[PDB]
Write a protein that binds this DNA or RNA. Structure first.
Ligand SMILES: Nc1ncnc2c1ncn2[C@@H]1O[C@H](COP(=O)(O)OP(=O)(O)OP(O)(O)=S)[C@@H](O)[C@H]1O
Ligand SMILES: Nc1ncnc2c1ncn2[C@@H]1O[C@H](COP(=O)(O)OP(=O)(O)O)[C@@H](O)[C@H]1O
Ligand SMILES: [Mg+2]
Ligand SMILES: [Mg+2]
Lengths: 319, 614, 257
DNA sequence: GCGGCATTCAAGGAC
DNA sequence: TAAATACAGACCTAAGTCCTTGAATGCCGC
DNA sequence: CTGTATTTA
């Protein structure tokens, strides 16, 4: 081997706002903003792999044309979160003179904006206030709560949601058409099912399946990509008899190499997000799983503790 | 399923929704009520016209309705009221029509004003260069004068008077406070939620009163050395731009002074090394007006400013004031907007006018008209996700409706854990403080309040054990979700219901500080007396003190002022001191509390004992 | 288009060094007469003015009065690269977005072309009206710089007292105080170190020590300093050039009671 | 003898 | 004088490391 | 929540 080829995430990364299959309303708003100009300050939030960084990148490209090189300051906020960075480099770029078309502005992209420190986040407010007529800020984060309220006060807020199955399927079919890949409907359904609304993860799984087996079929997908781990745990707690829950814990989880701490964390998360049972039952189950987790975190993590967890949950469900 | 009523058919009516309505959610019902112009208030008052009665409605709601004799209406009654009422409201209806006409007239007036300013600017440009559409609606429509500021008129007037009488108070060395109470403090703090106009009002009053503006972002420059370099040298020097710009005509004699505007005061650092204390000391000695603007006032880092300067609270602007401004910016940007949604716009933004303007600018690019039809997706995608204060966290966590089946379906357990995680340092403390002071509404059949409180306290003990295991060695921080449910969610669920009295702040911090101070005092006493006691700290506290009180204090009560020598000898035998003697009497409780016993002792005996100690 | 050729780049290097620690952003206005630059301090307490005439350049070119918004830190970084024996050429094209600095060696053919991005400085053009002062003197820059450096170690406030043809520099700090008394004298064989003073009214002003240090940091463009006092006007601290000057307008303290 | 920069460390915050 | 609503009560300490960040220490360059 | 400050009735 001498070299590798570009991954389908990067090779088929959209370069225009039309190629994005995300939320139609916000994408159309971004297209209209790019067509008209006067882009306002914004923060885009959502879950990983739904088209947040790509959307802002294509928006900046379409807005600035050939002036992207000298009009876009793209920094990973987690990479550069120091208050000194905002004080010196961001400030100098904001005051920098640049002759631009009468509807376009310099764009500051702050990727992973949720990781910025408090000092830089507070220092950015006056920087974005005094140079708001020639410098525009677009934050890309996963949690809006990590950004201070005054920072959110001066900008538009774009909450991206999980991609629907139809959009992911359409993008996947477009990729297969552009790559000439042998596929099966069951394989694409499995890819979507294990994607859980993350387009990047779906694309990566599809590319890995093609490179490893060649045929996108459900059997191959489940062989190379395991089924979502929380679903087995959810089936495990919701068992009617203790024997079945013990069997799932033994075979699907313990004999497959899943660590005890992972199992207890997944059970905690599933019971937190569970909706089939009542509130009191859920809180009592979380109590028992938390006690077992406390036992595991001391290094007592074995199969006996998880067996006791399931037995005590089944006692709780036994009225 | 709801019939299309005539426009503004509910105009002029005050509607309060009570109970749970099985067809429409309470929020959806409120939005639909505001859709036809009905005024929605959360509390039943004498001005309420119609109250919509639902299931499980609070009993004191019903008592208030009974005393006020206000008509109670069910879901079919609301159906008929929507269907049959004539358009535009058909004695409150004419009053609200006059109000709406006044708002529309004011909107048109300031629209003509704005287009006239644009025409004047174009004429000036022709006579002689940022393009208008390149500016945000926030900066293009920023208030150019105090008369365009909406809401907080009282605070603006107070700040204006404080700034105007600043020189008069300085001439008297800030001794005369005056009727307004402003003039003794040389510095002014402005605190409130972001985006209400505190900085705008401060700049407006600074420029209107002739004071030369000096602005420095506290968060941008947060250092003691930087503060000394840029402010100390600026505290008592005149301005160059103030002299060079204009000094010949008689405008004002205070144009060579400085008004120092420090924004983002809460953004500095804390502790002694932080500039917050330096600026607090600056607020004590200065020859120029000092105006500070902050978003969060009551903070541990912001403690020094609590009493030093004069505080001004800018609150959430009223909807009525904001309606005129949004109407003006709507007619000027030619996008249609009815006022019936403005209230619902204010309610979801939590009174942040900058964010409302930003939302209007961002959304009008695609939807040239915004109506009651799409308002749900507008509000749902622009909700203010801010961390609630610990008091609101305690109020929400102890709400009996939340743990009901409908509440559980709506406000899921994940939302409960997020509410705990909004402030995880105080939520368990508040929950433990005020969980046994709520009247329950989720008691199981055959369970009393005492049983529920006992189970809640048991879960509190488990949560405290988890918290100790977390905040100790091995840093078991991944157990934080567990501490979410054991300390707060489960105990609140056990005793959920209505709030009987008031939500008291957790007293455990104060008792902890008092216990630590008493323990330090006992440590000093024990290490002073170790030469004779040869007993541990707790052993000296429990047993030695009931005898030490009798050896020291009782002779003063039973013998007068001739027992000073014996007490002095006893205290010198154990190397006891005056401060130690004062601290000894503060340890006893119950039937033996010396807080009044020492006052009963004649002052002559105390003076003689102090002289003997000296 | 503009193409201005200096004699030595070190001259502009010292010019930029003189007023780089007081202001950060400067508008350089270029006209057929030369270059003028006025900048207000971030505290709006010290104004910096600079004039460089057409006779201070080896070659000068200007087709229209042009404004250049420059950051002094970046300018110092660019000019630090040059040496003492290079010719410096400032070049600006139509629609100025950047300024080119050419360093050309006279003994070799090596050329160093640097680019500096301009800044948008929304500052108003004010007029520095000249009015007769009450006291105007000239004394060596080195001596004044030494007095400021010694007196700044006690306090941040410096009292200037010109009375009875005596100059008094007073620094009253937390630990003691410091007073310097100077009597003007005319020394024949070198007038360079002489003190030429004209006093009409005795003036009592007070200034900031930090601004004084920032002003004396430019004690490399001349031998003496033209120091002009006024009781109701900011003082003028001037360093003369071969064809221009560097003035500091320093606003005094409040002379309460 | 300063001038400048780099390195280190202590104070606060977060989980 | 009442409606009508905002909205404020209050800020903890030991602990473990990591992170930032101001400021002092330290050295080299001139 | 109670209690108080502010705005409008
Ligand atoms: N009362 C008001 N009336 C009209 N416009 C307002 C009002 N308050 C704020 N705005 C708008 O909001 C913009 C910014 O207001 P600011 O005063 O900067 O907000 P703020 O209250 O200072 O909060 P910060 O900056 O986060 S501390 C102004 O330029 C106006 O366009
Ligand atoms: N809506 C979408 N349409 C098309 N491709 C998408 C979409 N969302 C994500 N992707 C793919 O995911 C890759 C990177 O996603 P990215 O936008 O960085 O995720 P995030 O939104 O978490 O930043 C891109 O190469 C792109 O091809
Ligand atoms: Mg990304
Ligand atoms: Mg502000």
């Amino acid at each position: 081997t001498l070299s590798l080829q570009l991954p389908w995430v990067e090779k088929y990364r959209p370069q225009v706002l039309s190629d994005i299959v995300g939320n139609k309303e916000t994408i159309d708003r971004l297209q209209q903003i790019a067509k008209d100009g006067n882009m306002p300050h914004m923060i885009i939030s959502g879950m990983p792999g739904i088209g947040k960084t790509t959307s802002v990148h294509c928006l900046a490209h379409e807005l600035l044309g050939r002036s992207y090189a000298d009009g876009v300051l793209e920094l990973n906020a987690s990479d550069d979160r120091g208050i000194d960075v905002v004080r010196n480099q961001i400030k100098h770029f904001a005051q920098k003179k640049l002759h631009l078309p009468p509807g376009k502005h310099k764009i500051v992209i702050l990727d992973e904006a949720d990781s910025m420190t408090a000092g830089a986040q507070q220092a950015l407010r006056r920087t974005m206030e005094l140079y708001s007529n020639s410098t525009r800020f677009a934050f890309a984060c996963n949690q809006s709560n990590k950004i201070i309220e005054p920072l959110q006060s001066r900008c538009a807020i774009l909450r991206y949601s999980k991609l629907s199955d139809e959009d992911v399927l359409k993008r996947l079919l477009q990729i297969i058409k552009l790559e000439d890949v042998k596929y099966t409907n069951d394989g694409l359904e499995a890819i979507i099912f294990t994607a859980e609304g993350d387009m990047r993860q779906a694309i990566n799984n599809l590319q890995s399946t093609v490179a490893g087996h060649g045929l996108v079929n459900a059997d191959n997908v489940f062989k190379i990509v395991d089924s979502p781990h929380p679903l087995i745990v959810k089936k495990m707690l919701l068992a009617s008899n203790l024997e079945d829950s013990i069997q799932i814990l033994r075979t699907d989880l313990w004999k497959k190499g899943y660590s005890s701490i992972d199992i207890v964390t997944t059970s905690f998360r599933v019971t937190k997000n569970l909706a089939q049972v009542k509130e009191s039952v859920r809180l009592e189950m979380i109590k028992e799983i938390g006690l077992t987790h406390m036992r595991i975190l001391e290094g007592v993590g074995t199969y006996l503790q998880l067996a006791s967890m399931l037995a005590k949950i089944h006692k709780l469900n036994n009225k | 399923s709801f019939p299309e009523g005539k426009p503004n058919c509910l105009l002029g009516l005050t509607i309060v929704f009570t109970g749970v309505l099985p067809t429409l959610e309470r929020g959806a019902s409120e939005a639909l009520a505001k859709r036809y112009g009905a005024r929605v208030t959360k509390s039943i008052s004498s001005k309420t016209s119609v109250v919509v009665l639902g299931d499980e409605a609070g009993p004191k709601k019903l008592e208030k309705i009974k005393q006020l004799k206000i008509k109670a209406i069910d879901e079919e009654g609301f159906k008929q009221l929507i269907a049959g009422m004539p358009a535009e409201g058909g004695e409150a209806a004419e009053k609200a029509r006059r109000k709406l006409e006044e708002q529309h007239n004011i909107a048109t007036k300031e629209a003509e004003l704005l287009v006239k300013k644009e025409e004047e600017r174009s004429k000036k440009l022709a006579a002689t260069v940022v393009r208008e559409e390149d500016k945000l609606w926030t900066v293009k429509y920023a208030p150019t004068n105090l008369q365009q500021v909406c809401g907080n008129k009282g605070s603006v007037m107070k700040l204006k008077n404080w700034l105007a009488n600043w020189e008069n108070s300085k001439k008297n060395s800030f001794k005369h406070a005056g009727k307004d109470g402003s003039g003794v403090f040389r510095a002014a703090m402005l605190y409130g939620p972001p985006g209400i106009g505190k900085t705008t009002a401060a700049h407006l009053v600074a420029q209107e009163l002739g004071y030369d503006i000096l602005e420095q972002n506290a968060s941008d420059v947060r250092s003691k050395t930087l503060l000394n370099a840029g402010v100390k040298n600026a505290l008592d020097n005149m301005s160059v731009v103030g002299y060079f710009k204009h000094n010949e005509e008689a405008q004002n004699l205070n144009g060579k002074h400085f008004v120092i505007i420090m924004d983002e005061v809460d953004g500095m650092s804390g502790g002694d090394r932080g500039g917050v204390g330096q600026l607090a000391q600056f607020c004590r000695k200065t020859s120029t007006p000092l105006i500070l603007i902050c978003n969060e006032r009551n903070l541990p880092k912001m403690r020094p400013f609590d009493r030093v300067c004069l505080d001004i609270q800018f609150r959430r602007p009223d909807a009525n004031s904001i309606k005129s401004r949004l109407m003006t910016i709507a007619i000027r940007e030619k996008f249609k907007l009815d006022p019936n949604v403005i209230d619902r716009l204010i309610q979801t933004t939590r009174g942040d006018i900058r964010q409302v303007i930003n939302l209007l600018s961002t959304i009008s690019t695609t939807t040239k008209t915004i109506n009651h039809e799409n308002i749900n997706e507008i509000s749902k995608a622009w909700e203010k996700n801010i961390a609630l204060k610990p008091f609101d966290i305690a109020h929400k966590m102890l709400d009996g409706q939340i743990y009901s089946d409908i509440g559980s379906r709506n406000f899921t357990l994940n939302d409960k854990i997020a509410l705990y995680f909004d402030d995880f340092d105080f939520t368990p403390l508040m929950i433990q403080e005020n969980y046994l002071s709520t009247r329950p509404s989720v008691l199981k059949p055959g369970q009393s309040h005492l049983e529920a409180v006992a189970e809640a306290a048991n879960c509190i003990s488990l949560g405290d054990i988890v918290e100790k295991k977390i905040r100790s060695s091995e840093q078991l921080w991944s157990l934080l979700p567990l501490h979410a449910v054991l300390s707060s969610v489960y105990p609140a669920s056990k005793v959920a219901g209505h709030m009987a009295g008031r939500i008291n702040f957790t007293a455990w911090l104060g008792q902890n500080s008092k216990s630590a101070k008493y323990y330090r005092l006992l440590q000093e006493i024990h290490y002073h007396t170790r030469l004779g006691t040869s007993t541990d700290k707790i052993g000296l506290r429990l047993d030695y003190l009931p005898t030490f009180r009798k050896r020291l204090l009782d002779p003063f009560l039973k013998q007068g002022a001739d027992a000073i020598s014996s007490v002095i000898e006893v205290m010198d035998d154990y190397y006891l001191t005056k401060e130690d003697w004062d601290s000894i009497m503060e340890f006893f409780v119950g039937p033996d509390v010396t807080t009044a016993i020492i006052k009963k002792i004649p002052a002559t005996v105390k003076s003689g004992f102090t002289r003997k100690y000296n | 288009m503009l193409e201005a050729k200096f004699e030595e780049a070190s001259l502009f290097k010292r010019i930029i060094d003189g007023f780089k620690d007081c202001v950060q952003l400067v508008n350089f206005q270029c006209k057929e007469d030369g270059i003028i630059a006025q900048a207000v301090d971030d505290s709006r307490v010290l104004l910096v003015s600079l004039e460089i005439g057409v006779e201070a350049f080896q070659e000068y070119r200007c087709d229209h009065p042009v404004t250049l918004g420059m950051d002094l830190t970046s300018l110092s970084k660019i000019l630090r690269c040059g040496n003492n024996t290079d010719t410096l050429t400032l070049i600006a094209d139509n629609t100025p977005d950047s300024i080119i600095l050419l360093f050309e060696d006279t003994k070799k053919d090596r050329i160093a072309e640097y680019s500096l991005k301009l800044m948008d400085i929304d500052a108003d053009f004010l007029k520095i009206e000249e009015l007769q002062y009450d006291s105007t003197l000239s004394l060596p820059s080195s001596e004044f710089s030494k007095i400021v450096r010694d007196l700044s170690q006690l306090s941040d406030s410096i009292n200037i007292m010109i009375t009875k043809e005596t100059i008094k520099f007073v620094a009253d700090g937390d630990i003691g105080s410091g007073s310097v008394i100077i009597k003007p004298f005319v020394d024949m064989e070198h007038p360079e170190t002489s003190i030429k003073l004209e006093m009409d009214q005795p003036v009592d002003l007070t200034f900031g020590a930090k601004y004084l240090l920032d002003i004396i940091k430019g004690s490399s463009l001349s031998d003496r300093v033209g120091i002009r006092l006024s009781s109701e006007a900011p003082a003028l601290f001037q360093f003369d050039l071969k064809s221009g000057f560097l003035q500091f307008f320093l606003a005094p303290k409040f002379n309460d009671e």
